[PDB]
Amino acid sequence: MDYILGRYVKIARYGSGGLVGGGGKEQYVENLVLWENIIKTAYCFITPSSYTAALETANIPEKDFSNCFRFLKENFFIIPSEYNNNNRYSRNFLHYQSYGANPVLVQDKLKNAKVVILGCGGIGNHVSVILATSGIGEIILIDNDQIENTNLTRQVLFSEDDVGKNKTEVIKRELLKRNSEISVSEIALNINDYTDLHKVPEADIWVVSADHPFNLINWVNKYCVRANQPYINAGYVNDIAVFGPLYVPGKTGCYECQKVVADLYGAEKENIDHKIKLINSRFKPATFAPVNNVAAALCAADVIKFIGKYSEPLSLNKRIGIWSDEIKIHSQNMGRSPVCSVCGN
């Protein structure tokens, strides 16, 4: 029954009242008197204190104190003293506390988790290092490519001295330089047929950050539905950052439930079809690190939330685009269809 003020609380005057808190839970309090009383209440909990011990020293009416305490609690501005107790993950612990979570139990779930990174290029680089430094206990890196100089625009764990080396081996070296408390392993594999997915180990979640052929995502989706394997896709369509869907067996839609994304990269007319296939074979995305990094970042966030259970991943039932040449975030609905030819009932 001791409470403490989270370190992530800040206070400002603003407009006709004030602000309490920052981020999604920031509250504007127009009533100045109420804002002042929230501050006085907040101040009682700098050190761990009971409701009654604070009510003893607050010097405002109990009616007002009760209101202020409820307000601070319902926004997780004050948290159980239990939840605040040196620690390399301590900034992440503030993030978990700010959602009303016990940060040690979240951290324990991350430590016990295994994640597969399928594809160790732009997306894979950025996701892997976030997960490693957030304390995901076991990371499996899958790729069969070598580092090229053009990769250095996005593939942040690679240096000039690394050109020609294998991607999995350099990611592993760089991850363990950043967090030597975790386990990393490599698998040299190119999934060029559906059947190669049998070589990919079961895990808490697959990060699907590989993109050849155009229908790899379709293969992965079908395999993961059949294998009861959660996955999340991320990447970009040229200048649009994409993340999601986050597929959870029996819970969310799969990639094919809703028919929003094109699946015929071709034509019913053979002459036209061959032209299309050539153009699409020659296709190289207009990669831009900022697009890459946004997609990767929000993909990693959803992995940490999926495993840590403290807040709902954004990409459940959704494939989310963030535009880079205008201000726009748009979700494609990928909710479950009872008539999905892949995952139905």
């Binding site: 290029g121 732009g122 369509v237 994409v242 094109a262 890459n292």
Partner: peptide
């Protein structure tokens, strides 16, 4: 974003 992504 009506086509698949690259990554």
């Amino acid at each position: 974003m009506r086509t698949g992504n690259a990554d």
